[PDB]
Enzyme design. Structure first.
Site, mmCIF file in Angstrom:
data_model
loop_
_atom_site.group_PDB
_atom_site.id
_atom_site.type_symbol
_atom_site.label_atom_id
_atom_site.label_comp_id
_atom_site.label_asym_id
_atom_site.label_seq_id
_atom_site.Cartn_x
_atom_site.Cartn_y
_atom_site.Cartn_z
ATOM 1 N N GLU A 77 0.799 -1.207 0.000
ATOM 2 C CA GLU A 77 0.000 0.000 0.000
ATOM 3 C C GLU A 77 0.838 1.266 0.000
ATOM 4 O O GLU A 77 0.269 2.385 0.183
ATOM 5 C CB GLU A 77 -0.977 -0.042 1.188
ATOM 6 N N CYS A 106 -3.870 -3.997 4.009
ATOM 7 C CA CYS A 106 -2.926 -5.045 4.424
ATOM 8 C C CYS A 106 -3.283 -6.381 3.800
ATOM 9 O O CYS A 106 -2.522 -7.374 3.951
ATOM 10 C CB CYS A 106 -2.886 -5.221 5.961
ATOM 11 N N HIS A 209 -2.856 -11.519 10.623
ATOM 12 C CA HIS A 209 -2.315 -10.324 10.199
ATOM 13 C C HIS A 209 -1.854 -9.571 11.485
ATOM 14 O O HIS A 209 -2.528 -9.630 12.518
ATOM 15 C CB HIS A 209 -3.403 -9.573 9.430
ATOM 16 N N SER A 283 -7.764 -3.184 6.188
ATOM 17 C CA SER A 283 -8.728 -2.157 6.531
ATOM 18 C C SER A 283 -9.592 -1.811 5.289
ATOM 19 O O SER A 283 -9.168 -2.022 4.102
ATOM 20 C CB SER A 283 -7.986 -0.938 7.129
#
Lengths: 356, 356
Positions: A77, A106, A209, A283
């Site tokens: 990202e 992520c 994660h 997210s």
């Protein structure tokens, strides 16, 4: 057909900021209890997503790999132009390949892994290189103590030597905060077990994660204290999985797989045929549960002195972390410590990369 | 198994800037000869990649599609958070799906199409929605007359009703300007024919990535004047393929497929079983040649009055195109003309979208 993760490389940046130093500077040791984080990797401006990516692939690739890879995907990202094209050239991969980026906070390296897998199924003589490379960068911000830098490279092929990937996966998208990582974990995990009829007991380890290890602990904690051998073994494998993250920080897309690596290199109880569950999250939000089984001999692809290598990182005072981490191009650059590749300069306005 | 493009939707923005107006304002009619471009779609700030994407999917999706789609990919070069998550919610797609973006300049929708295909092969009861949505935005810049806005949506599934996609594809990555689009076209096309043993003569039409139609003409021109029926037919199908782009401008990732659409709706000579070659390109650079065969009945999924619909766009003076096109958020927004979806406001700092 067995297709999966054959090799895993990892590279972080060459500097480290200790949490206690950040704490003392900002007048906050609540990072050690709160986040469960000791230190973070800080990247100078000459070591960016591309060079960390290339670094982590240089760890693992052979000449034969480079001739057989025909897809290079960069999950990140952190230019229009995909980082993957620079990585393709730096690594000398054969020219008839697809290179591109994948993006969704992520989560994206999980999608890269799925595409890579289907692609090798379909063309079982090829290999694919999946990169998950990021620099989490937020001074005085509340994201400051969850910064980080590094990249994981995975080589996907058939008859992999580390982890056989399975066909059963379940993703969820919910357009949407701890409550979210957690609710996405609960609902996805539930539907996952319902659809594929598996249970916590079919697994030796569960990896998450890992933006910071405390959030992952919470997610592990959501997991059926009703199995005491298993309950202890799972906790131990969980602690093994967070070890690297405690020293490196948040690396966004790579974090799940850095946990998998930290698990394979630090658990003393995993054996060939054991199955691992993995929860990917990004997210926004999207999540996915997917699984894998250890291949006999998988230790031979690992490293035993990674914790030693991370201690070689050059420590920074907060003042110097502020100076190096937040430096913007104006270009030529100061010479900083980097891995095998670095951003050499900008020839206006092309980023020039090369071997250092 | 037959897997491929079942339906294609397209949405552009609601305003149009005529090239002759831009020319008169900048003191340049060398856009009509040079670029072979008459008009471009201009997007207000309330119609962005997300809402154009959702628009183009709203054209084609049914309730059943929405229950069977479990992957939404957004190819774009125009937030961390993937546009695809907003599109997933706006369209009401079932929750157990993967949503993410793919990125590599104008190339990425070709990779999205390949992943979509392999995915449906592997899980033949599912469908995937591929979005290729972009706003090319460069005043007084030399990219100004190659601006544009729109998005193409493709629904991929088995027993598709428009275009069966084939397994033989060839991509090339070269870390690297007309000379490039062209050299990438020559080398990829050559190796393509060598590896799969096909020739210009196996095809009824060749479609190209189309930043502006003159560049595509050049690429078509590289194509073996040594076949006179074919030579004429190919030229005509080429002219048919550039028709929409002449009115809309550069839409980056969508451009190749907007050409495919313009071809299917404007050629009067294509029939079921005919094969089409397609050349995808993105700066950086990466390219790919892939092919497809028309399915019987494919006209039934098309529209016949698209050129009429584009004439409904509200014309802008240059002064007002400068005002609307280059507006930045400061938020609430003026009400502008949009498609079925729009950016309503920013609730700090979340973009709020909804049906208009």
């Amino acid at each position: 057909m067995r297709i999966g993760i054959d090799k895993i490389g990892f590279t972080s940046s060459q500097y480290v900021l200790n949490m206690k130093d950040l704490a003392e500077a900002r007048g906050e040791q609540k990072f050690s209890k709160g986040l469960l984080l000791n230190a973070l990797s800080i990247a100078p401006i000459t070591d960016d997503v591309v060079t960390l990516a290339a670094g982590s692939a240089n760890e693992i690739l052979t000449a034969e790999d480079k001739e057989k890879i025909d897809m290079v995907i960069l999950a990140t990202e952190s230019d229009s132009k995909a980082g993957a094209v620079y990585v393709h050239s730096l690594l000398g991969i054969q020219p008839f390949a697809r290179s591109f980026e994948m993006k969704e906070a992520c989560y994206s390296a999980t999608a890269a892994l799925n595409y890579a897998k289907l692609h090798v199924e379909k063309h079982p003589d090829t290999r694919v290189l999946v990169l998950a490379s990021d620099i989490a960068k937020y001074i005085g911000t509340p994201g400051e103590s969850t910064q980080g830098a590094g990249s994981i490279a995975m080589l996907v092929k058939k008859d992999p030597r580390i982890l056989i990937l399975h066909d059963e996966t379940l993703a969820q998208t919910r357009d949407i905060s701890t409550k979210q990582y957690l609710d996405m974990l609960k609902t996805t995990w539930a539907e996952y077990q319902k659809r594929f009829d598996v249970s916590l007991t079919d697994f030796a380890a569960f990896c998450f994660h890992l933006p910071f290890p405390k959030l992952a602990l919470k997610g592990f904690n959501k997991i059926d204290k009703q199995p005491s051998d298993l309950q202890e073994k799972l906790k131990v494998n969980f602690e093994a999985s967070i070890l690297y993250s405690k020293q490196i920080g948040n690396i966004y897309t790579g974090s799940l797989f850095l946990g998998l690596l930290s698990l394979l290199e630090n658990s003393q109880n995993l054996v060939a045929g054991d199955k691992i569950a993995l929860f990917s999250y990004g997210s926004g939000a999207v999540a996915e549960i997917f699984t894998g089984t250890l291949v006999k001999g998988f230790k031979e692809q690992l490293q035993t002195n990674r914790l030693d290598k991370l201690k070689r990182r050059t420590p920074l005072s907060v003042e110097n972390y502020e100076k190096i981490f937040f430096e913007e191009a104006q270009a030529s650059f100061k010479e900083y410590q980097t891995g095998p590749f670095a951003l050499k300069e900008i020839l206006e306005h092309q980023r020039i990369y090369g071997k250092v």
